[PDB]
Structures are given as C-alpha cells and as structure tokens.
C-alpha cells in the first residue's frame, strides 16, 4: 500500500 497525494 503506497502513499498517494489526494
């Protein structure tokens, strides 16, 4: 689970 903006 990667982090993504918005």
């Amino acid at each position, epitope marked *: 689970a*990667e*982090f993504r*903006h*918005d």
Partner: antibody
C-alpha cells in the same frame, strides 16, 4: 544553523548489517518527515525511504523492502536506517533529508535540507 | 511506480546563455515536481518545489514550469557557478523517484 549529520557508514561484507544514524539540530525534528536518499558511485540519486514526522507511516523503495528499516527517536533528534542483508548494489553515499510535507496527511513535498552524506561500501 | 525521464542527459553551454531542461513523468503527478542541483562531491541543493515555487534564497534566474506530466527548468542567463548536474524528483506518490540527471558543462 539547521543541520543534518550522517554517520555509521563504512566497509561491510555482503549479507551483513549496518546501522546509519543522522543527527538533526537547529530545528523542530519531531515536526518534519525524514528521507534517506542514496547515490551509487558515479550514478544518479535514488530514493530509499521516508518516515512520517510522528514515526507512524514508513515507505520504502522496492529493492530494500524487508531488508531496510527506517526509524526515528524524536527525543534524541536522530534518524536511523537499519540496513540488513546487504548486497553489493547497496554501495552508495547515503544522505538524510528533511521534508516539511504538504496536504492534510503531511506527505512528502520537498527536501530543503540535506546532510553531507555517509559512504557505505559493500564488499567481501 | 512513476518513471522520471530527463532530457537531455548532457548539454554544453557558455556563461550568459539561456538553458532549459525537461523532466517527463510516466503519469500525472499534478505539480508535485522538484528540481535539485548537485556539484561533484557535494550534497544536492533544492532549487524549485511545486513545479514553479522557488526555494527561499535561490537566485531569481532559476524558474520552473509545467503540470501533469511535462515540466521545464529554466536558467535565464547562465553563471559560472551553475555548471552542475540537475535532477528532477516527483513527490506525488511513493516510491518517490528522481530523474536520470542533466549535466550542464562548459562549451568550448
């Protein structure tokens, strides 16, 4: 005088471990996210890992998942990188960098302050 | 994972010239694009964040433009100190990725 100072680098054999440290001074450490960025000899910049300001979220580049662990001790103003099961291709200069963050969750934005770096050589 | 393609990998220029570099992203990163300068043996230095915002203290000659997938770094009139390597970096989603680097060398 805001400073980031890496230490812990050296010569290490493949499959062995190394702990990098990064001592922060001159600002509010526990309010910034921190990154580890590396540069293999003669190559470009490669992102390694980020840890949130509160130490609650951690992300890693794929080639180091399950081998590297990023941690922080906000009390000691110190960032750490635990490097297990080292390979030759981990040979690089390692930099820590602070990231202020953006958005509601304070995810990465930009890296305005860097350390001078510490050199890791993985060789038998 | 987003790929950052930087072009050209090298270029020659002389003092006073206008130089531009390009970073292209394999998919939209909105405007979470940063530009760094690095000289041999030294740590990177942030020049531009958020595609166009300029880091406090950086000369006014440096400018950046772009959104989505195409981005530009501009030096208005070159200076002797500017001959260095420039990397772009997307800050939209992990894993964070840098471009390959663009070396700015002295023309002769």
């Amino acid at each position: 005088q805001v400073q980031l100072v890496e230490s812990g680098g050296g010569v290490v054999q493949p499959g062995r471990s190394l702990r990098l440290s990064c001592a922060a001074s001159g600002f509010a450490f526990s309010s910034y996210g921190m990154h580890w960025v590396r540069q293999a000899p003669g190559k470009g910049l490669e992102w390694v890992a980020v840890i949130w300001f509160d130490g609650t979220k951690k992300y890693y580049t794929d080639s180091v998942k399950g081998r590297f662990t990023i941690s922080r001790d906000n009390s000691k103003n110190t960032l750490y990188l635990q490097m297990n099961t080292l390979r030759a291709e981990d040979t690089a200069v390692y930099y820590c960098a602070r990231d202020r963050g953006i958005g509601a969750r304070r995810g990465p934005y930009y890296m305005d302050v860097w350390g001078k770096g510490t050199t890791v050589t993985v060789s038998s | 994972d987003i790929q950052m393609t930087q072009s050209p990998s090298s270029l020659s220029a002389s003092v006073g010239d206008r130089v531009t570099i390009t970073c292209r992203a394999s998919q939209s990163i909105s405007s979470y694009l940063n530009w760094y300068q690095q000289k041999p043996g030294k740590a990177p230095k942030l020049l531009i964040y958020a595609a166009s915002s300029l880091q406090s203290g950086v000369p006014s000659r440096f400018s950046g433009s772009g959104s989505g997938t195409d981005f530009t770094l501009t030096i208005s009139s070159l200076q002797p100190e500017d001959f260095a390597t420039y990397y772009c970096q997307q800050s939209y989603s992990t894993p964070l990725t840098f471009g390959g680097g663009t070396k700015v060398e002295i023309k002769r």
